[PDB]
Design a protein around this ligand. Structure first.
Ligand SMILES: O=P(O)(O)OCCNS(=O)(=O)c1ccc(OC(F)(F)F)cc1
Ligand SMILES: C=C(/N=C/c1c(COP(=O)(O)O)cnc(C)c1O)C(=O)O
Ligand SMILES: c1ccc2[nH]cnc2c1
Ligand SMILES: c1ccc2[nH]cnc2c1
Ligand SMILES: c1ccc2[nH]cnc2c1
Ligand SMILES: [Cs+]
Ligand SMILES: [Cs+]
Lengths: 268, 395
């Protein structure tokens, strides 16, 4: 979790918000995915959210469903994802790395062993999409024992009990959901609810990153203006991969321009 | 926090994205409230009797057990309005949707019987219904697609994954996670996140209650065993529930063996899978070594699902119920046998249950046993599928 703490202290010193891209590991292939991630970082990503391909990603819309499918077509497994994570960390010692997991992949052959593998490879956080705080005990306990931040979700209609639980249980950052529904660039989320941002701060929650439907620099600026510590964009980034499958070079150039623009918006 | 226990031993829970937790808690609260509301119960009972046609008959087979010491009764859910047991709990959930001020219904369907039930209840009670159905199932259960659409439901083909029931479930849940403020998710089986396995059991438990009263009237004793197919668990838990505390009554659930367990092309996670987390629940799953969810297979769309409801996982774990499998070929033989010897055309799902009871009798023909098979549905939806198979053969 320390890599997030250091990042947010640095960004606070610079009076800056974070921009955090999501991609699926191994989409469209291992070697291209590694180059994609190097391009995201070089373009100014403050941290990464990285998906391990899962057969049935129920919090994800078609764009990221299709990313998962491409990774599987390339034969990507969780073991190969961990091989990729080692390589990424070896090149980039300080960038925070969060994984986006589905429960079955964590539970599969032992929750403890999963978080141990995360620590061994130098992952900083794990967000298990289909484990609400109510079912989280063994996941968050295993995370903290292995110095991994467990990430929890503050939905738009979060009540006070939930705000207090999320503030107490989570580390690294708090996920501030922009809207109901599944991941998707087309479905734009609302402005960060200021009262949630303010309540999380009151309860000493990990800093908030807004996500779901954040696809333009204007939304990034609005998120930081509203008091969030930054923003996550996934589908918008993945659409650039999908659009440019036949043009690996154009893919990277377009990823670079987009990420640069998104990051610049976080300085506002 | 919940009002009711979300677990059956290790199995069950509420493994959904955080966004959906309030909807699940609201539904649990509405259910607890409705269960103690005499007006709700009177409305539900009235619909079951005067609209759906309950109680359903308990029929003694006259021919198929000749020359053996097996007495076999069929609990006639095939006679329910809509043509399967699915109609029972849809009527209760539709009333809950209205109680919660929802005007929209989302449902998954495989065999199309839950889809038809969802559509008919929505037509009756003034709800806007949309149904997800795997594209493979749209073809192999086509008569039900026509029935749903005639009743004004939107039927949405799902092409993703196996294009069968699990993929329909996935799309229904994804839809609900964005539409829950106005839509009720009318989950069609005793599986998924709490409170669904509990609500579905309680809204199907008249099956076993009636069966008990009927067999006592006709035989003066309880069955030696009740036998039901298990796609997600609703018809089986509906039959089982009232007999759980009758320790002498065997509870036998039948999973689809597909082309044979050894082929990997089956739908029998309770006996051949391992515990995992998917579709909102911790339950036995067909999964790869790495924990990806596998695609299931059965000739029967209603059984073709790679998991199972948590209460069955639990009843199995403690040995209270036994679970077995029946292959496509065994189910087809049972289908033909019932058509030709009892004049009843069963759903292929239900034919798996029948096939097991026929095996119990044939294997041990001098064993005295009084058996009830839950005949969960009629086979009209399957006649074209079965015809085509028997023709590609020579029968
Ligand atoms: O920009 P979008 O709309 O594609 O959204 C990208 C989000 N990617 S992610 O890893 O942060 C992410 C975070 C949480 C998710 O589900 C949960 F909220 F239920 F936990 C799913 C994905
Ligand atoms: C999946 C569906 N049907 C399941 C089904 C089943 C298996 O589902 P349960 O395990 O929930 O009873 C049994 N019998 C009949 C006639 C059925 O139609 C459906 O209609 O959508
Ligand atoms: C949660 C709520 C009610 C319960 N009853 C028994 N165990 C429980 C857990
Ligand atoms: C598998 C089998 C048959 C199908 N029909 C439409 N989609 C399918 C997938
Ligand atoms: C398994 C899974 C989902 C279902 N919906 C209706 N019957 C089912 C069986
Ligand atoms: Cs007999
Ligand atoms: Cs099954």
């Amino acid at each position: 979790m320390e890599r997030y703490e250091n990042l947010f202290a640095q960004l606070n010193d610079r009076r800056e918000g974070a921009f955090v891209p999501f991609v699926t590991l191994g989409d469209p292939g291992i070697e291209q995915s590694l180059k994609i991630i190097d391009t995201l970082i070089d373009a100014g990503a403050d941290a990464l959210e990285l998906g391990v391909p899962f057969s049935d990603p129920l919090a994800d819309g078609p764009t990221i469903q299709n990313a998962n499918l491409r990774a599987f077509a390339a034969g990507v497994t969780p073991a190969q994802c961990f091989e990729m994570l080692a390589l990424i960390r070896e090149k980039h010692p300080t960038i925070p790395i969060g994984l986006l997991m589905y429960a079955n992949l964590v539970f599969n052959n032992g929750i403890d062993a999963f978080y141990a593998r995360c620590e061994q490879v130098g992952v900083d956080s794990v967000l298990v999409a289909d484990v609400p705080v109510e079912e989280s005990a063994p996941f968050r306990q295993a995370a903290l024992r292995h110095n991994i931040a467990p990430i929890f979700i503050c939905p738009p209609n979060a009540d006070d009990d939930l705000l207090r639980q999320v503030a107490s249980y989570g580390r690294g950052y708090t996920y501030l959901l922009s809207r109901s529904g599944v991941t998707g660039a087309e479905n734009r989320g609302a402005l960060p609810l200021h009262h949630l941002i303010e309540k999380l701060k009151e309860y000493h929650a990990a800093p908030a990153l807004q996500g779901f439907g954040i696809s333009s620099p204007e939304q990034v600026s609005a998120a930081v203006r509203a008091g969030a510590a930054g923003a996550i964009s996934g589908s918008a980034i993945v659409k650039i991969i999908e659009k440019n499958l036949a043009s690996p070079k154009q893919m990277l150039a377009e990823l670079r321009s987009f990420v640069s623009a998104m990051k610049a918006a976080s300085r506002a | 926090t919940t009002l009711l226990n979300p677990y059956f031993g290790e199995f069950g829970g509420m493994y959904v994205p955080q966004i959906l937790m309030p909807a699940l808690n609201q539904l649990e609260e509405a259910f607890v409230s409705a269960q103690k509301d005499p007006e709700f119960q009177a409305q539900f009972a009235d619909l079951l009797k005067n609209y759906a046609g309950r109680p359903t008959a308990l029929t003694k087979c006259q021919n198929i057990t000749a020359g053996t010491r097996t007495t076999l009764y069929l609990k006639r859910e095939d006679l329910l309005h809509g043509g399967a047991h699915k109609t029972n709990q849809v009527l209760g959930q539709a009333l809950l949707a209205k109680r919660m001020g929802k005007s929209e219904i989302i449902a998954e369907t495989g065999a199309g019987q839950h889809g038809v039930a969802s559509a008919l209840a929505s037509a009756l009670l003034g709800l806007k219904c949309r149904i997800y159905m795997g594209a493979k199932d749209v073809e192999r259960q086509s008569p039900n697609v026509f029935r749903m659409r005639l009743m004004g439901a939107e039927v949405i083909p799902v092409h993703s994954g196996s294009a069968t029931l699990k993929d329909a479930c996935n799309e229904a849940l994804r839809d609900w996670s964005g539409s829950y403020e106005t839509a009720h998710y009318m989950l069609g089986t005793a599986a998924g996140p709490h409170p669904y396995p509990t609500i579905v059991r309680e809204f199907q438990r008249m099956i076993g209650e009636e069966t008990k009263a009927q067999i006592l009237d006709k035989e003066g004793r309880l069955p030696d065993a009740v036998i039901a197919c298990v796609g997600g668990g609703s018809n089986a838990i509906g039959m089982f529930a009232d007999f759980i505390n009758d320790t002498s009554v065997g509870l036998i659930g039948v999973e689809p063996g597909g082309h044979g367990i050894e082929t990997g092309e089956h739908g029998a996670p309770l006996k051949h899978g391992r515990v995992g987390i998917y579709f909102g629940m911790k339950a036995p799953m067909m999964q790869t070594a790495d924990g990806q969810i596998e695609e299931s297979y059965s000739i029967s769309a209603g059984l073709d699902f790679p998991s199972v409801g948590p209460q069955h996982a639990y009843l199995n774990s403690i040995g209270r119920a036994d679970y077995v499998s029946i292959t496509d070929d065994e189910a087809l033989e049972a289908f033909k046998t019932l058509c030709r010897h009892e004049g009843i055309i069963p759903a292929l799902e239900s034919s798996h249950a029948l096939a097991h009871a026929l095996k119990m009798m044939r294997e041990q023909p001098e064993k005295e046993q009084l058996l009830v098979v839950n005949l969960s549905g009629r086979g009209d939806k399957d006649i074209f599928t079965v015809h085509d198979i028997l023709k590609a053969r020579g029968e």
